Amino acid sequence: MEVVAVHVIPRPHVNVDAALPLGRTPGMDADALGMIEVRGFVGMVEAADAMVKAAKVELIGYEKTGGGYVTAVVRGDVAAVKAATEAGQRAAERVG
Amino acid sequence: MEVVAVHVIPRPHVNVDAALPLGRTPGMDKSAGSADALGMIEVRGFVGMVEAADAMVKAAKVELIGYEKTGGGYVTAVVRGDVAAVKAATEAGQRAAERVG
Amino acid sequence: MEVVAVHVIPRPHVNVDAALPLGRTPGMDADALGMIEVRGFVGMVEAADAMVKAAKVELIGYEKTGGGYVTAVVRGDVAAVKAATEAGQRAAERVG
Amino acid sequence: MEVVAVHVIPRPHVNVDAALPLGRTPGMDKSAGSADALGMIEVRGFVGMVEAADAMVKAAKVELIGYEKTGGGYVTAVVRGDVAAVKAATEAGQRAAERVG
Amino acid sequence: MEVVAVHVIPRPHVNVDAALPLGRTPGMDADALGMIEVRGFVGMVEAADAMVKAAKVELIGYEKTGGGYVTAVVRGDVAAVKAATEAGQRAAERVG
Amino acid sequence: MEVVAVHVIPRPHVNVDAALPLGRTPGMDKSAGSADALGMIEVRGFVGMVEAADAMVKAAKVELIGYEKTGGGYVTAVVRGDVAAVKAATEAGQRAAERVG
Numbered sequence: 001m002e003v004v005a006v007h008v009i010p011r012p013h014v015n016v017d018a019a020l021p022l023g024r025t026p027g028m029d030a031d032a033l034g035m036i037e038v039r040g041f042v043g044m045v046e047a048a049d050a051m052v053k054a055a056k057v058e059l060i061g062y063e064k065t066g067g068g069y070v071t072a073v074v075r076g077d078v079a080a081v082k083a084a085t086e087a088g089q090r091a092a093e094r095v096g
Numbered sequence: 097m098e099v100v101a102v103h104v105i106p107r108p109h110v111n112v113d114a115a116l117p118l119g120r121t122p123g124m125d126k127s128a129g130s131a132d133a134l135g136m137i138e139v140r141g142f143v144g145m146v147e148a149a150d151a152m153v154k155a156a157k158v159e160l161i162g163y164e165k166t167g168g169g170y171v172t173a174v175v176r177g178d179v180a181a182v183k184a185a186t187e188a189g190q191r192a193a194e195r196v197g
Numbered sequence: 198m199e200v201v202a203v204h205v206i207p208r209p210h211v212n213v214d215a216a217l218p219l220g221r222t223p224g225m226d227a228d229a230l231g232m233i234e235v236r237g238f239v240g241m242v243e244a245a246d247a248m249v250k251a252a253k254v255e256l257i258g259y260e261k262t263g264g265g266y267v268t269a270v271v272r273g274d275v276a277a278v279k280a281a282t283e284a285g286q287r288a289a290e291r292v293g
Numbered sequence: 294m295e296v297v298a299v300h301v302i303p304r305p306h307v308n309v310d311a312a313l314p315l316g317r318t319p320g321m322d323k324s325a326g327s328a329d330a331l332g333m334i335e336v337r338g339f340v341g342m343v344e345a346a347d348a349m350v351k352a353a354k355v356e357l358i359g360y361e362k363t364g365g366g367y368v369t370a371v372v373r374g375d376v377a378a379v380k381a382a383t384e385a386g387q388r389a390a391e392r393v394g
Numbered sequence: 395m396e397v398v399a400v401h402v403i404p405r406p407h408v409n410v411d412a413a414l415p416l417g418r419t420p421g422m423d424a425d426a427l428g429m430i431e432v433r434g435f436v437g438m439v440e441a442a443d444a445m446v447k448a449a450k451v452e453l454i455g456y457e458k459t460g461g462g463y464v465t466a467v468v469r470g471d472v473a474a475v476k477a478a479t480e481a482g483q484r485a486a487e488r489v490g
Numbered sequence: 491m492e493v494v495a496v497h498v499i500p501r502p503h504v505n506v507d508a509a510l511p512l513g514r515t516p517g518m519d520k521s522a523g524s525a526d527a528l529g530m531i532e533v534r535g536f537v538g539m540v541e542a543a544d545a546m547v548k549a550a551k552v553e554l555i556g557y558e559k560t561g562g563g564y565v566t567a568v569v570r571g572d573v574a575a576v577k578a579a580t581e582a583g584q585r586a587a588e589r590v591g
Contacts, residue, residue, distance in 0.1 A: 001101060005491060005537035007590050013547040019554045020540060037537045039563070041164050041172040042101035042138045045116060052111045059115040063536050066263065066364075066460065066561035067168035068140075071536040095103055097202060142260050142268040143202035143234045146217060153210040160216045167263035167364060167460075167561060169236070196204050198298060238361050238369040239298035239335045242313060249308045256312040263460065263561075264365035265337075292300055294399060339457050339465040340399035340431045343414060350407040357413045364460035364561060366433070393401050395495060435558050435566040436495035436532045439510060446505045453509040461562035462534075489497055 001096055003047075004037035004069065006089040010078040022073055023060025034081035036088045037071040043095045047088035048072040054087030055080040097196045099148070100138040100170065102186050106179045108134045119161025119176050135175040135182040137189045142171055144193045149173040151192030156185040198293055200244075201234035201266065203286040207275040219270055220257025231278035233285045234268040240292045244285035245269040251284030252277040294393045296345070297335040297367065299383050303376045305331045316358025316373050332372040332379040334386045339368055341390045346370040348389030353382040395490055397441075398431035398463065400483040404472040416467055417454025428475035430482045431465040437489045441482035442466040448481030449474040491590045493542070494532040494564065496580050500573045502528045513555025513570050529569040529576040531583045536565055538587045543567040545586030550579040 009016075010032050017024045024031055034057065038044040048059050057076035064070050074084055105112075108131055113120045120132055135158060137148040145163060153160050158177035165171050175185055206213075207229050214221045221228055231254065235241040245256050254273035261267050271281055302309075305328055310317045317329055332355060334345040342360060350357050355374035362368050372382055403410075404426050411418045418425055428451065432438040442453050451470035458464050468478055499506075502525055507514045514526055529552060531542040539557060547554050552571035559565050569579055 005535055005590050007537045007541055009541065009544055013544050013554075015547045015554045016540065016544045019556050020543065022540070033540070035537045035540065037535055040101055040138060041166050041170070042103045042136045045112065045118070045134075045136065046103060046105065048116065049105050049109050049112045052109045059109075059111045061115050064166055065536050065559055065563050065565055066166075067563040068166045068170040069168075069534075069536070069563035070166055095101055140266075141202055141234055142262050142266070143204045143232045146213065146219070146230070146232065147204055147206065149217065150206055150210050150213045153212045160210075160212045162216050165262055168563075169262050169264040169266035169365075171262055196202050237298055237335060238363050238367070239300045239333045242309065242315070242331075242333065243300060243302065245313065246302050246306050246309045249306045256306075256308045258312050261363055263363075265363045265367040266365075267363055292298055337463075338399055338431055339459050339463070340401045340429045343410065343416070343427070343429065344401055344403065346414065347403055347407050347410045350409045357407075357409045359413050362459055366459050366461040366463035366562075368459055393399050434495055434532060435560050435564070436497045436530045439506065439512070439528075439530065440497060440499065442510065443499050443503050443506045446503045453503075453505045455509050458560055460560075462560045462564040463562075464560055489495055 001040055001043045003089055003092050004039060006036050006085050008081050008085055009033040023075055031075035032078040032081035034074045034085040035071050038092055039068045041070055043092040044070045044072050046095050047092040050091030051084040051088040055083035057081055057084045097141055097144045097193060099190055099193050100140055102137050102190045104182050104186055105134040118174055132176040133179040133182040135186040136172050138172040139193055140169045144196045145171045145173045147196045148189035148193040152185040152189035155188035156181040158182055158185040198237055198240045200286055200289050201236060203233050203282050205278050205282055206230040220272055228272035229275040229278035231271045231282040232268050235289055236265045238267055240289040241267045241269050243292050244289040247288030248281040248285040252280035254278055254281045294338055294341045294390060296387055296390050297337055299334050299387045301379050301383055302331040315371055329373040330376040330379040332383040333369050335369040336390055337366045341393045342368045342370045344393045345386035345390040349382040349386035352385035353378040355379055355382040395434055395437045397483055397486050398433060400430050400479050402475050402479055403427040417469055425469035426472040426475035428468045428479040429465050432486055433462045435464055437486040438464045438466050440489050441486040444485030445478040445482040449477035451475055451478045491535055491538045491587060493584055493587050494534055496531050496584045498576050498580055499528040512568055526570040527573040527576040529580040530566050532566040533587055534563045538590045539565045539567045541590045542583035542587040546579040546583035549582035550575040552576055552579040
C-alpha cells in the first residue's frame, strides 16, 4: 500500500526530543530517529514489525494525527535506523 | 463493502506487542517468566469492521482483542491466535466484510 | 441521504459483544445486532428513531469513528432487528 | 453556505432521548414520575452552525441544548421545543446558514 | 489562503452564549460575536492576530471541529467585531 | 513533501499568546511584572512536521514549543524566538519539509 512518508533524522535536536513524543526525552538516561507514516493502521503495524526485525532499533510507539494517519517511530544508531526504515517501507508497500 | 487492508503477521516481534495496543502485552500471562499470530482487518466503516470481526471469531480459534480507531471513519479489528487459525479467520472476515452493504 | 451501511448480525459471537461497545456485555444479565452507519449525525438520529419505533429493539447508543461517521446500534430478536434496520434505512434515505 | 442536513423529529422515541445526547434525558424534570420535538441543523462548519443556532432560537420558542461534534469538521446544532416551534425554528436556521459566507 | 467562513452576529441570543463555547457565558459579569473558520491552524492564528490588532475585540479562544477545521472567536461591540473580522479575513487570505 | 502553510508573525498580540497554545503565556517569565516572534509550519504529515521542526531549531536561535493537532492528519510545528531568527528558521524548515518523501 501507499506510504505517506518514510524519513530518517540521524541526529535530532535536543529540543525536538523534548517537545515532541518520539521516545527519547532528554535526561531519561542522541539516537537516530526513523519514522514511517501511513494512512492505514494495518500498514503501519506491518512496517513497524519489519523495522524492528530488520535492524537493531526500538519501536517507541506511534502517533495518531486523525483522518486515518498514523506514524510508527523507531530510534537507534543511524545505520540501524536507515536499514529499518528501508525495510519498513518495502514491507508496507507489499501490504495488499 | 470495500476493505482497506487485510493482513496477518505470523510472529509479531515482541517490541510490536509491547508498544502497540494489539492485545498481547509481553509478560501478561500466568506462565510468563512464540507470540500469538496477529490478524487485522481495516475498514472505513464500523459496520463492516464489526461484521469482519464476527466472521473472524466464528471461523477459527482466534481471539478478538479489540479494535483501533484512527479517525476519519477508519477502524481496525484485531485478532490473535495460532498462525493457521489467524489466516483462516482473516480470510473469512475479508469475505464477510465484502458482503456488507 | 446516503447511508454507509445497514447490517444485521442475527447471533453475534460472545467475543464480539465482550470486546466491542455494542450494548450487551456478556454476563450483564444472545440478542441480534442491527447497525446503521451514516456520514451524518442527523441521518443517524432519524434512522435510530425509526428503528426503535418500527420494532421491539433497543437503541443502545452510537459509535463515533471520526470524519463525520456515526453508527446507531440496536439489539433485539432477529426478526425485530431486521424489521428495525429496514425501517431505519428507509427513514435515513428520506432525510433531505 | 451549504447545509449538510436539516430535520425535525416531532415526537422522538424515549429510547432516542435516553441513549443520545439530545438534551431531554427522560426523567430529568420537576414533574417526571409527550417529549419535546427535536430540530437539528448539521453543517461542515462551526460558523454556519452557530449562525443556524442563533437564527433558530430567535425565530421560535425552542431551546438550543448543545451541539454534536462528529469530527471531520462536522457539527450539528440541536434544538428542542413544541412541534410547530421547532419546524419554524429549523426553517429559519436553514435560511440563516444559507446566508453565511 | 482560502477561508471557510467569516461571520458576525451583532446580538447573539443568550441561549447561544450559554450553550456554546463562545467566551461570554451569561452571568459571568451582549457583546457582538465574530468568527473566522479556516481549514488551517496557521491561517486561523494569523486571522486571530489581525483581528485583535485591527479593533477593540478579545480573542476568547478557538474551536477545533476535526478534519483540520478551526474557528477563531472574538467578541466586542458590533462595529469593532465587523472591523476585526474584515481585517482577519484579509490577513488569512494573504497567507501563502 | 507539500507544506500546507509557512508563516511568521513578528510581534504577536498578547491576546493571541494568552488565548492560543503558542508557548508564550503572558506573565510566564522570571522578570514578568516585546513578545517573541512566532513561526509556524503546517503539514498534512507528522513526518514532514518533525523534519520541519528539526530543521528550524538547527537553523536559528528559536525554541520549538510544541505542535498543534487539528485532526485529519494536520499538524503544525510552532517555534518562538527573535524576528530574524524565526524568519531564518521557518525558511529552513520549509526547505527541509520539501525534501521529505
